[PDB]
Amino acid sequence: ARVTVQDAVEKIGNRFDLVLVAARRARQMQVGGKDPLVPEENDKTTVIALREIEEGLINNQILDVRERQEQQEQEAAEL
Amino acid sequence: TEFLKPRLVDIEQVSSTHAKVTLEPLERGFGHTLGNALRRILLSSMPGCA
Amino acid sequence: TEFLKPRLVDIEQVSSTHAKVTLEPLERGFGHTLGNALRRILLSSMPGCAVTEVEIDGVLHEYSTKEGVQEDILEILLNLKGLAVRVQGKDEVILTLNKSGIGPVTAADITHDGDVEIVKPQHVICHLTDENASISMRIKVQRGRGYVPASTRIHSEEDERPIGRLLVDACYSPVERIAYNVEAARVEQRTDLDKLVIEMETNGTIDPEEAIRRAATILAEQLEAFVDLRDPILLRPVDDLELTVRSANCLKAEAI
Amino acid sequence: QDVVLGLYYMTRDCVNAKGEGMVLTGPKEAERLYRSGLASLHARVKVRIT
Amino acid sequence: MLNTCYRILGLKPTVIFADQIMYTGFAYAARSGASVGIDDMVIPEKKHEII
Amino acid sequence: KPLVGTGMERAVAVDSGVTAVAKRGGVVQYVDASRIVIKVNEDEMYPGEAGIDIYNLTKYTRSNQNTCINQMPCVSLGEPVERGDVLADGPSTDLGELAL
Amino acid sequence: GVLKIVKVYLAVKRRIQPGDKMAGRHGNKGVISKINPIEDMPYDENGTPV
Amino acid sequence: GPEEITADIPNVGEAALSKLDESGIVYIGAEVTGGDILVGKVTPKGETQLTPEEKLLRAIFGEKASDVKDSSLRVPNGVSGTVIDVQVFTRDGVEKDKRA
Amino acid sequence: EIKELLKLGDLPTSGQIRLYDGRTGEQFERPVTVGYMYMLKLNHLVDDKM
């Protein structure tokens, strides 16, 4: 999380794919206003979205499953 | 004479025989005054049985 | 238990600035504990008096000169740092120095108060060389501890001092040097006892018994954290209600 | 450069220093002996380790 | 010693162990007191006779 | 001043021209913080003029590198001064010795 | 085109600081890293600190 | 129009004018800090082009902006000094101020 | 000629005296070279660099 991100790069698999996932999750807690799954512990959004990944709560599919299923409820209430 | 007497803020107890004590804030030049005058007594003059 | 308490036994005065203080009896290992703890408190936590602000007439800043005065004002303002003044009653006195004629200006020219005692009355302040020249200054002596520079003082106090008040850095601490030794004093049963001979070099302003009595009180009270301690809508103006203008000639007429 | 000098001084060997041959029940009292002056830093002893 | 720690134990016990080496090397190099005087630069006694 | 020097400090300070050496020998008459007036000896006095040398010291002045130039007198009232003696220290001299 | 110039002379007083570069005559430069209090400096048997 | 060295500086407090004299130059002996005004100077402006919103703010409270624009010499930041000298040069025919 | 001048001032001819720690009061293990070096303050100040 804070000191080292070594434990997080096995839950995703790459140093380069960790940045493109954790910046997509921390974007949602910045401007989207979505709620964090972990305790906040007075942390910034970049450290929380890294901490969510290393406890297995955020993956690249989970950010794709929840974003696709959120549209299909907005694609119901309009029509 | 307006010295800053600290607050015993923390007693972090690891086990029933281990501890960490934090003490802040102190005047400068009083961390080593109180820290060393307590370490030399805890090592050399504490009474007990053996 | 089998402990023992020390005692103040001997205060040998070598000079007006040098002293020796013996503390006995101490047990083994307690000579270096009370020796080194009282060396750090006496060198940093003792009160004393020092010159803070100087105001000489006919002088705007410290980078100027004076007719007849041999030293520059940056050299006069650095001689007043070493002024040894013991103030008894108050916390802040203002002195006054006036001297006319050819000769060195010393500390024995200050018009003395009844409770202000100058320790070294031969401390050279200035040197007058012309016959018509006369110096005049109002020296402010305060009381504190530690060391406080003057660049803190302008950043703290936003008040407008008049142009002509030269500030001095204040080094209030009276103690200049201290060393100690741990010898052995003779006791007929307890042969394993020690003594503590604390040397103390300073200026005046401090009795060497009052220094160790005040150093061993700052230490004893810093161990107190170790032994015992382990309607908002009321005051608004009237135009925040969107009232009728026929009442705006009514409410103000009664001085509401 | 300065971390290696304090490491070379501490993990050194002396033939005649102090406390030669005494037996110690762990590393935690090899510091009680050094700080109270009863043993030297480089001095051959026997320590029960784990 | 730092490389043996990295291969058996990982990255997180290496960063902690590399700081505590720096805290213990700095502390006991000051407990000793190490200097250089003009007596530490020694000469062989037989320097004149070899020349 | 340096405690351990080399002997060549007194020749850098006088030859830099940043001090105020005495042109003629004599006795100091009036010292200020800004002006030195020396009364010339009779054997060194040319037979027309009054024989008084007057030196005006440069006070707190900016250098090229935005530092301070300040000359301070190092003689007292009523003492003899020979030719080539140092009357006023420069910015980084001490009684005519270079003190960096 | 210039009507009038005003030149104002300031006088600053700079003390030493952590970061100020000091050096000796033998090619041994360096920067100040800390300004340590008096009672923490090493002292000899007469009491005069370094 | 000619620029002028004045103390009447627009859109600034009365404590910022507490170090300048009547002519607009700092006192010899003043202890200045970063940001403080040393010499008060203004230039004449052109005609400002108002925005649609700022055309309303002036038309509500009523503060007009004159033909005067602040370009006074201030102390460079990070410097805290003491004014020891002021030199004023003036072109021939131009009238001198009360401090010149 | 330096070691004869150190005898005239009653100082050790090695040039190394015994220093004590200022914070813990302990004596350093080896004697430390103490003397008077003439130090300069160069024109690279941290007020101009930052």
Side-chain angles (χ1 to χ4, degrees), chain F residues 44-75:
Chain F
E44 307 184 18
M45 201 163 63
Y46 302 124
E49 74 273 359
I52 284 186
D53 281 329
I54 175 152
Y55 298 91
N56 303 293
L57 318 178
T58 86
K59 292 285 105 178
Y60 293 80
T61 316
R62 203 175 49 87
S63 59
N64 269 347
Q65 274 76 21
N66 293 333
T67 52
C68 199
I69 297 170
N70 177 33
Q71 277 190 305
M72 297 157 284
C74 69
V75 289

PDB file of all heavy atoms in Angstrom, chain F residues 44-75:
ATOM      1  N   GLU F  44      60.289  65.037   8.107  1.00  0.00           N
ATOM      2  CA  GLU F  44      59.608  64.598   6.899  1.00  0.00           C
ATOM      3  C   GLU F  44      58.692  65.665   6.322  1.00  0.00           C
ATOM      4  O   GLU F  44      57.947  65.381   5.382  1.00  0.00           O
ATOM      5  CB  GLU F  44      58.809  63.324   7.181  1.00  0.00           C
ATOM      6  CG  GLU F  44      59.630  62.207   7.808  1.00  0.00           C
ATOM      7  CD  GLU F  44      58.836  60.932   7.997  1.00  0.00           C
ATOM      8  OE1 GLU F  44      57.781  60.787   7.349  1.00  0.00           O
ATOM      9  OE2 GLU F  44      59.266  60.074   8.794  1.00  0.00           O
ATOM     10  N   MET F  45      58.732  66.881   6.857  1.00  0.00           N
ATOM     11  CA  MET F  45      57.849  67.953   6.426  1.00  0.00           C
ATOM     12  C   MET F  45      58.577  68.836   5.419  1.00  0.00           C
ATOM     13  O   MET F  45      59.649  69.370   5.716  1.00  0.00           O
ATOM     14  CB  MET F  45      57.384  68.775   7.625  1.00  0.00           C
ATOM     15  CG  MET F  45      56.108  69.558   7.384  1.00  0.00           C
ATOM     16  SD  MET F  45      55.352  70.100   8.924  1.00  0.00           S
ATOM     17  CE  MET F  45      56.629  71.184   9.553  1.00  0.00           C
ATOM     18  N   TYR F  46      57.995  68.982   4.239  1.00  0.00           N
ATOM     19  CA  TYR F  46      58.520  69.860   3.209  1.00  0.00           C
ATOM     20  C   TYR F  46      58.229  71.317   3.571  1.00  0.00           C
ATOM     21  O   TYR F  46      57.162  71.624   4.106  1.00  0.00           O
ATOM     22  CB  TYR F  46      57.905  69.497   1.864  1.00  0.00           C
ATOM     23  CG  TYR F  46      58.159  68.058   1.484  1.00  0.00           C
ATOM     24  CD1 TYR F  46      57.111  67.196   1.193  1.00  0.00           C
ATOM     25  CD2 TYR F  46      59.453  67.560   1.421  1.00  0.00           C
ATOM     26  CE1 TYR F  46      57.344  65.879   0.844  1.00  0.00           C
ATOM     27  CE2 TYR F  46      59.698  66.247   1.074  1.00  0.00           C
ATOM     28  CZ  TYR F  46      58.641  65.410   0.788  1.00  0.00           C
ATOM     29  OH  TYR F  46      58.883  64.100   0.445  1.00  0.00           O
ATOM     30  N   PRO F  47      59.157  72.241   3.287  1.00  0.00           N
ATOM     31  CA  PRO F  47      59.169  73.527   4.005  1.00  0.00           C
ATOM     32  C   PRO F  47      58.102  74.532   3.587  1.00  0.00           C
ATOM     33  O   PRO F  47      58.206  75.698   3.980  1.00  0.00           O
ATOM     34  CB  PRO F  47      60.568  74.072   3.693  1.00  0.00           C
ATOM     35  CG  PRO F  47      60.862  73.534   2.344  1.00  0.00           C
ATOM     36  CD  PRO F  47      60.297  72.141   2.355  1.00  0.00           C
ATOM     37  N   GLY F  48      57.096  74.150   2.809  1.00  0.00           N
ATOM     38  CA  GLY F  48      56.051  75.090   2.457  1.00  0.00           C
ATOM     39  C   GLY F  48      54.742  74.913   3.205  1.00  0.00           C
ATOM     40  O   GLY F  48      54.140  75.896   3.643  1.00  0.00           O
ATOM     41  N   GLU F  49      54.298  73.671   3.373  1.00  0.00           N
ATOM     42  CA  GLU F  49      52.941  73.381   3.812  1.00  0.00           C
ATOM     43  C   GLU F  49      52.879  73.077   5.307  1.00  0.00           C
ATOM     44  O   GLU F  49      53.895  72.952   5.994  1.00  0.00           O
ATOM     45  CB  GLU F  49      52.366  72.209   3.011  1.00  0.00           C
ATOM     46  CG  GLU F  49      52.930  70.851   3.394  1.00  0.00           C
ATOM     47  CD  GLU F  49      54.195  70.512   2.642  1.00  0.00           C
ATOM     48  OE1 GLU F  49      54.629  71.331   1.808  1.00  0.00           O
ATOM     49  OE2 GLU F  49      54.755  69.424   2.884  1.00  0.00           O
ATOM     50  N   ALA F  50      51.643  72.946   5.800  1.00  0.00           N
ATOM     51  CA  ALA F  50      51.397  72.758   7.226  1.00  0.00           C
ATOM     52  C   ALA F  50      51.757  71.361   7.703  1.00  0.00           C
ATOM     53  O   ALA F  50      51.965  71.169   8.905  1.00  0.00           O
ATOM     54  CB  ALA F  50      49.931  73.048   7.553  1.00  0.00           C
ATOM     55  N   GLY F  51      51.823  70.389   6.799  1.00  0.00           N
ATOM     56  CA  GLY F  51      52.246  69.050   7.153  1.00  0.00           C
ATOM     57  C   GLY F  51      51.240  68.280   7.980  1.00  0.00           C
ATOM     58  O   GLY F  51      51.538  67.870   9.103  1.00  0.00           O
ATOM     59  N   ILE F  52      50.041  68.081   7.439  1.00  0.00           N
ATOM     60  CA  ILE F  52      49.018  67.265   8.082  1.00  0.00           C
ATOM     61  C   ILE F  52      48.426  66.349   7.019  1.00  0.00           C
ATOM     62  O   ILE F  52      47.917  66.826   5.999  1.00  0.00           O
ATOM     63  CB  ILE F  52      47.922  68.117   8.748  1.00  0.00           C
ATOM     64  CG1 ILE F  52      48.439  68.703  10.063  1.00  0.00           C
ATOM     65  CG2 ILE F  52      46.673  67.295   9.007  1.00  0.00           C
ATOM     66  CD1 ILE F  52      47.399  69.443  10.873  1.00  0.00           C
ATOM     67  N   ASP F  53      48.523  65.042   7.234  1.00  0.00           N
ATOM     68  CA  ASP F  53      47.936  64.056   6.339  1.00  0.00           C
ATOM     69  C   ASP F  53      46.606  63.600   6.911  1.00  0.00           C
ATOM     70  O   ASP F  53      46.511  63.287   8.099  1.00  0.00           O
ATOM     71  CB  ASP F  53      48.864  62.858   6.145  1.00  0.00           C
ATOM     72  CG  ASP F  53      49.973  63.137   5.161  1.00  0.00           C
ATOM     73  OD1 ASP F  53      49.751  63.926   4.221  1.00  0.00           O
ATOM     74  OD2 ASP F  53      51.067  62.566   5.329  1.00  0.00           O
ATOM     75  N   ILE F  54      45.583  63.565   6.066  1.00  0.00           N
ATOM     76  CA  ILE F  54      44.229  63.269   6.500  1.00  0.00           C
ATOM     77  C   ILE F  54      43.689  62.130   5.642  1.00  0.00           C
ATOM     78  O   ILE F  54      43.774  62.175   4.409  1.00  0.00           O
ATOM     79  CB  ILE F  54      43.332  64.521   6.447  1.00  0.00           C
ATOM     80  CG1 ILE F  54      41.883  64.185   6.780  1.00  0.00           C
ATOM     81  CG2 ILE F  54      43.489  65.294   5.138  1.00  0.00           C
ATOM     82  CD1 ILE F  54      41.163  65.345   7.393  1.00  0.00           C
ATOM     83  N   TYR F  55      43.190  61.088   6.294  1.00  0.00           N
ATOM     84  CA  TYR F  55      42.718  59.885   5.624  1.00  0.00           C
ATOM     85  C   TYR F  55      41.232  59.721   5.892  1.00  0.00           C
ATOM     86  O   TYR F  55      40.799  59.778   7.045  1.00  0.00           O
ATOM     87  CB  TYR F  55      43.480  58.653   6.112  1.00  0.00           C
ATOM     88  CG  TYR F  55      44.966  58.688   5.843  1.00  0.00           C
ATOM     89  CD1 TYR F  55      45.846  59.216   6.773  1.00  0.00           C
ATOM     90  CD2 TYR F  55      45.489  58.181   4.664  1.00  0.00           C
ATOM     91  CE1 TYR F  55      47.199  59.248   6.531  1.00  0.00           C
ATOM     92  CE2 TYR F  55      46.843  58.213   4.416  1.00  0.00           C
ATOM     93  CZ  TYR F  55      47.690  58.748   5.354  1.00  0.00           C
ATOM     94  OH  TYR F  55      49.040  58.780   5.118  1.00  0.00           O
ATOM     95  N   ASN F  56      40.458  59.523   4.833  1.00  0.00           N
ATOM     96  CA  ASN F  56      39.018  59.341   4.932  1.00  0.00           C
ATOM     97  C   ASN F  56      38.683  57.910   4.547  1.00  0.00           C
ATOM     98  O   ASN F  56      38.969  57.483   3.424  1.00  0.00           O
ATOM     99  CB  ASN F  56      38.276  60.330   4.037  1.00  0.00           C
ATOM    100  CG  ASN F  56      38.626  61.764   4.344  1.00  0.00           C
ATOM    101  OD1 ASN F  56      38.306  62.280   5.413  1.00  0.00           O
ATOM    102  ND2 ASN F  56      39.282  62.425   3.398  1.00  0.00           N
ATOM    103  N   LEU F  57      38.069  57.181   5.467  1.00  0.00           N
ATOM    104  CA  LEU F  57      37.847  55.756   5.296  1.00  0.00           C
ATOM    105  C   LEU F  57      36.523  55.512   4.592  1.00  0.00           C
ATOM    106  O   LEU F  57      35.534  56.201   4.850  1.00  0.00           O
ATOM    107  CB  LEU F  57      37.863  55.048   6.650  1.00  0.00           C
ATOM    108  CG  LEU F  57      38.943  55.502   7.631  1.00  0.00           C
ATOM    109  CD1 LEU F  57      38.815  54.757   8.935  1.00  0.00           C
ATOM    110  CD2 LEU F  57      40.325  55.304   7.053  1.00  0.00           C
ATOM    111  N   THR F  58      36.509  54.531   3.695  1.00  0.00           N
ATOM    112  CA  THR F  58      35.289  54.175   2.984  1.00  0.00           C
ATOM    113  C   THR F  58      34.403  53.361   3.912  1.00  0.00           C
ATOM    114  O   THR F  58      34.809  52.299   4.393  1.00  0.00           O
ATOM    115  CB  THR F  58      35.591  53.380   1.717  1.00  0.00           C
ATOM    116  OG1 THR F  58      35.701  51.994   2.040  1.00  0.00           O
ATOM    117  CG2 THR F  58      36.894  53.835   1.097  1.00  0.00           C
ATOM    118  N   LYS F  59      33.205  53.853   4.164  1.00  0.00           N
ATOM    119  CA  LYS F  59      32.237  53.168   5.003  1.00  0.00           C
ATOM    120  C   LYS F  59      31.429  52.197   4.146  1.00  0.00           C
ATOM    121  O   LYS F  59      31.843  51.873   3.030  1.00  0.00           O
ATOM    122  CB  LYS F  59      31.399  54.194   5.759  1.00  0.00           C
ATOM    123  CG  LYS F  59      32.183  54.968   6.812  1.00  0.00           C
ATOM    124  CD  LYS F  59      32.452  54.119   8.056  1.00  0.00           C
ATOM    125  CE  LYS F  59      33.868  53.612   8.192  1.00  0.00           C
ATOM    126  NZ  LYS F  59      33.992  52.862   9.461  1.00  0.00           N
ATOM    127  N   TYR F  60      30.279  51.738   4.651  1.00  0.00           N
ATOM    128  CA  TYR F  60      29.617  50.520   4.192  1.00  0.00           C
ATOM    129  C   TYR F  60      29.173  50.635   2.740  1.00  0.00           C
ATOM    130  O   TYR F  60      28.136  51.226   2.431  1.00  0.00           O
ATOM    131  CB  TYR F  60      28.410  50.214   5.087  1.00  0.00           C
ATOM    132  CG  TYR F  60      28.749  49.828   6.515  1.00  0.00           C
ATOM    133  CD1 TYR F  60      29.071  50.789   7.467  1.00  0.00           C
ATOM    134  CD2 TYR F  60      28.733  48.504   6.915  1.00  0.00           C
ATOM    135  CE1 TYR F  60      29.382  50.433   8.766  1.00  0.00           C
ATOM    136  CE2 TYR F  60      29.044  48.140   8.204  1.00  0.00           C
ATOM    137  CZ  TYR F  60      29.364  49.106   9.124  1.00  0.00           C
ATOM    138  OH  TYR F  60      29.667  48.732  10.409  1.00  0.00           O
ATOM    139  N   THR F  61      29.960  50.035   1.853  1.00  0.00           N
ATOM    140  CA  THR F  61      29.855  50.226   0.417  1.00  0.00           C
ATOM    141  C   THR F  61      29.708  48.870  -0.255  1.00  0.00           C
ATOM    142  O   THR F  61      30.276  47.877   0.201  1.00  0.00           O
ATOM    143  CB  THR F  61      31.090  50.963  -0.123  1.00  0.00           C
ATOM    144  OG1 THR F  61      31.402  52.051   0.749  1.00  0.00           O
ATOM    145  CG2 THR F  61      30.853  51.523  -1.508  1.00  0.00           C
ATOM    146  N   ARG F  62      28.932  48.829  -1.326  1.00  0.00           N
ATOM    147  CA  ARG F  62      28.728  47.596  -2.061  1.00  0.00           C
ATOM    148  C   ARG F  62      29.950  47.280  -2.909  1.00  0.00           C
ATOM    149  O   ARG F  62      30.558  48.172  -3.503  1.00  0.00           O
ATOM    150  CB  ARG F  62      27.493  47.726  -2.946  1.00  0.00           C
ATOM    151  CG  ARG F  62      26.862  46.423  -3.320  1.00  0.00           C
ATOM    152  CD  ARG F  62      25.585  46.669  -4.078  1.00  0.00           C
ATOM    153  NE  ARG F  62      25.782  47.634  -5.149  1.00  0.00           N
ATOM    154  CZ  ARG F  62      26.181  47.316  -6.370  1.00  0.00           C
ATOM    155  NH1 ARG F  62      26.427  46.053  -6.682  1.00  0.00           N
ATOM    156  NH2 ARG F  62      26.335  48.264  -7.281  1.00  0.00           N
ATOM    157  N   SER F  63      30.310  46.005  -2.959  1.00  0.00           N
ATOM    158  CA  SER F  63      31.370  45.542  -3.836  1.00  0.00           C
ATOM    159  C   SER F  63      30.757  45.117  -5.165  1.00  0.00           C
ATOM    160  O   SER F  63      29.588  45.388  -5.445  1.00  0.00           O
ATOM    161  CB  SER F  63      32.149  44.409  -3.179  1.00  0.00           C
ATOM    162  OG  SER F  63      31.298  43.328  -2.875  1.00  0.00           O
ATOM    163  N   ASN F  64      31.543  44.456  -6.011  1.00  0.00           N
ATOM    164  CA  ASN F  64      30.997  43.951  -7.264  1.00  0.00           C
ATOM    165  C   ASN F  64      30.099  42.747  -7.037  1.00  0.00           C
ATOM    166  O   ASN F  64      29.127  42.556  -7.773  1.00  0.00           O
ATOM    167  CB  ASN F  64      32.122  43.582  -8.225  1.00  0.00           C
ATOM    168  CG  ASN F  64      32.513  44.721  -9.124  1.00  0.00           C
ATOM    169  OD1 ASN F  64      31.808  45.718  -9.220  1.00  0.00           O
ATOM    170  ND2 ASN F  64      33.640  44.579  -9.797  1.00  0.00           N
ATOM    171  N   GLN F  65      30.410  41.922  -6.040  1.00  0.00           N
ATOM    172  CA  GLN F  65      29.667  40.704  -5.764  1.00  0.00           C
ATOM    173  C   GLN F  65      28.604  40.902  -4.695  1.00  0.00           C
ATOM    174  O   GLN F  65      28.204  39.925  -4.052  1.00  0.00           O
ATOM    175  CB  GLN F  65      30.625  39.585  -5.359  1.00  0.00           C
ATOM    176  CG  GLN F  65      31.200  38.813  -6.523  1.00  0.00           C
ATOM    177  CD  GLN F  65      32.280  39.574  -7.257  1.00  0.00           C
ATOM    178  OE1 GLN F  65      32.886  40.492  -6.713  1.00  0.00           O
ATOM    179  NE2 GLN F  65      32.527  39.196  -8.502  1.00  0.00           N
ATOM    180  N   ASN F  66      28.150  42.147  -4.503  1.00  0.00           N
ATOM    181  CA  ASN F  66      27.137  42.541  -3.518  1.00  0.00           C
ATOM    182  C   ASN F  66      27.535  42.157  -2.095  1.00  0.00           C
ATOM    183  O   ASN F  66      26.743  41.607  -1.334  1.00  0.00           O
ATOM    184  CB  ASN F  66      25.758  41.975  -3.869  1.00  0.00           C
ATOM    185  CG  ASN F  66      25.192  42.574  -5.132  1.00  0.00           C
ATOM    186  OD1 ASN F  66      25.517  43.697  -5.497  1.00  0.00           O
ATOM    187  ND2 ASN F  66      24.335  41.825  -5.808  1.00  0.00           N
ATOM    188  N   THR F  67      28.772  42.458  -1.735  1.00  0.00           N
ATOM    189  CA  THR F  67      29.247  42.284  -0.371  1.00  0.00           C
ATOM    190  C   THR F  67      29.604  43.653   0.192  1.00  0.00           C
ATOM    191  O   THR F  67      29.343  44.687  -0.420  1.00  0.00           O
ATOM    192  CB  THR F  67      30.432  41.317  -0.302  1.00  0.00           C
ATOM    193  OG1 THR F  67      31.440  41.720  -1.232  1.00  0.00           O
ATOM    194  CG2 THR F  67      29.991  39.901  -0.620  1.00  0.00           C
ATOM    195  N   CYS F  68      30.200  43.657   1.376  1.00  0.00           N
ATOM    196  CA  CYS F  68      30.402  44.874   2.143  1.00  0.00           C
ATOM    197  C   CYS F  68      31.873  45.257   2.150  1.00  0.00           C
ATOM    198  O   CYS F  68      32.739  44.409   2.380  1.00  0.00           O
ATOM    199  CB  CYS F  68      29.905  44.694   3.573  1.00  0.00           C
ATOM    200  SG  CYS F  68      29.616  46.220   4.429  1.00  0.00           S
ATOM    201  N   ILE F  69      32.144  46.532   1.900  1.00  0.00           N
ATOM    202  CA  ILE F  69      33.470  47.119   2.037  1.00  0.00           C
ATOM    203  C   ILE F  69      33.396  48.117   3.180  1.00  0.00           C
ATOM    204  O   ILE F  69      32.567  49.031   3.155  1.00  0.00           O
ATOM    205  CB  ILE F  69      33.922  47.798   0.739  1.00  0.00           C
ATOM    206  CG1 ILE F  69      34.051  46.765  -0.378  1.00  0.00           C
ATOM    207  CG2 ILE F  69      35.223  48.535   0.953  1.00  0.00           C
ATOM    208  CD1 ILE F  69      34.249  47.373  -1.736  1.00  0.00           C
ATOM    209  N   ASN F  70      34.247  47.941   4.184  1.00  0.00           N
ATOM    210  CA  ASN F  70      34.152  48.752   5.395  1.00  0.00           C
ATOM    211  C   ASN F  70      35.526  48.834   6.034  1.00  0.00           C
ATOM    212  O   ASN F  70      36.068  47.808   6.453  1.00  0.00           O
ATOM    213  CB  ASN F  70      33.143  48.149   6.359  1.00  0.00           C
ATOM    214  CG  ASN F  70      33.058  48.901   7.658  1.00  0.00           C
ATOM    215  OD1 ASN F  70      33.218  50.115   7.696  1.00  0.00           O
ATOM    216  ND2 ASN F  70      32.798  48.183   8.737  1.00  0.00           N
ATOM    217  N   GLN F  71      36.075  50.042   6.124  1.00  0.00           N
ATOM    218  CA  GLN F  71      37.403  50.269   6.676  1.00  0.00           C
ATOM    219  C   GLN F  71      37.300  50.769   8.109  1.00  0.00           C
ATOM    220  O   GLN F  71      36.608  51.752   8.380  1.00  0.00           O
ATOM    221  CB  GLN F  71      38.176  51.273   5.827  1.00  0.00           C
ATOM    222  CG  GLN F  71      38.846  50.664   4.626  1.00  0.00           C
ATOM    223  CD  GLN F  71      39.781  51.622   3.942  1.00  0.00           C
ATOM    224  OE1 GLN F  71      39.390  52.719   3.559  1.00  0.00           O
ATOM    225  NE2 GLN F  71      41.027  51.216   3.784  1.00  0.00           N
ATOM    226  N   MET F  72      38.007  50.106   9.020  1.00  0.00           N
ATOM    227  CA  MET F  72      37.979  50.434  10.430  1.00  0.00           C
ATOM    228  C   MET F  72      39.372  50.808  10.916  1.00  0.00           C
ATOM    229  O   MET F  72      40.340  50.125  10.571  1.00  0.00           O
ATOM    230  CB  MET F  72      37.464  49.252  11.256  1.00  0.00           C
ATOM    231  CG  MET F  72      36.046  48.850  10.950  1.00  0.00           C
ATOM    232  SD  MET F  72      35.712  47.143  11.417  1.00  0.00           S
ATOM    233  CE  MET F  72      36.525  46.259  10.090  1.00  0.00           C
ATOM    234  N   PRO F  73      39.510  51.862  11.717  1.00  0.00           N
ATOM    235  CA  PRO F  73      40.845  52.303  12.137  1.00  0.00           C
ATOM    236  C   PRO F  73      41.443  51.395  13.202  1.00  0.00           C
ATOM    237  O   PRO F  73      40.757  50.942  14.118  1.00  0.00           O
ATOM    238  CB  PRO F  73      40.590  53.711  12.685  1.00  0.00           C
ATOM    239  CG  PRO F  73      39.184  53.688  13.120  1.00  0.00           C
ATOM    240  CD  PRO F  73      38.453  52.761  12.210  1.00  0.00           C
ATOM    241  N   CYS F  74      42.743  51.128  13.068  1.00  0.00           N
ATOM    242  CA  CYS F  74      43.454  50.243  13.985  1.00  0.00           C
ATOM    243  C   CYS F  74      44.620  50.950  14.669  1.00  0.00           C
ATOM    244  O   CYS F  74      45.590  50.309  15.075  1.00  0.00           O
ATOM    245  CB  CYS F  74      43.928  48.979  13.267  1.00  0.00           C
ATOM    246  SG  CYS F  74      45.246  49.188  12.058  1.00  0.00           S
ATOM    247  N   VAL F  75      44.533  52.273  14.810  1.00  0.00           N
ATOM    248  CA  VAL F  75      45.428  53.036  15.667  1.00  0.00           C
ATOM    249  C   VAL F  75      44.577  53.816  16.656  1.00  0.00           C
ATOM    250  O   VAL F  75      43.406  54.106  16.411  1.00  0.00           O
ATOM    251  CB  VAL F  75      46.346  53.994  14.885  1.00  0.00           C
ATOM    252  CG1 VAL F  75      47.382  53.216  14.114  1.00  0.00           C
ATOM    253  CG2 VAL F  75      45.532  54.875  13.957  1.00  0.00           C
TER     254      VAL F  75
END
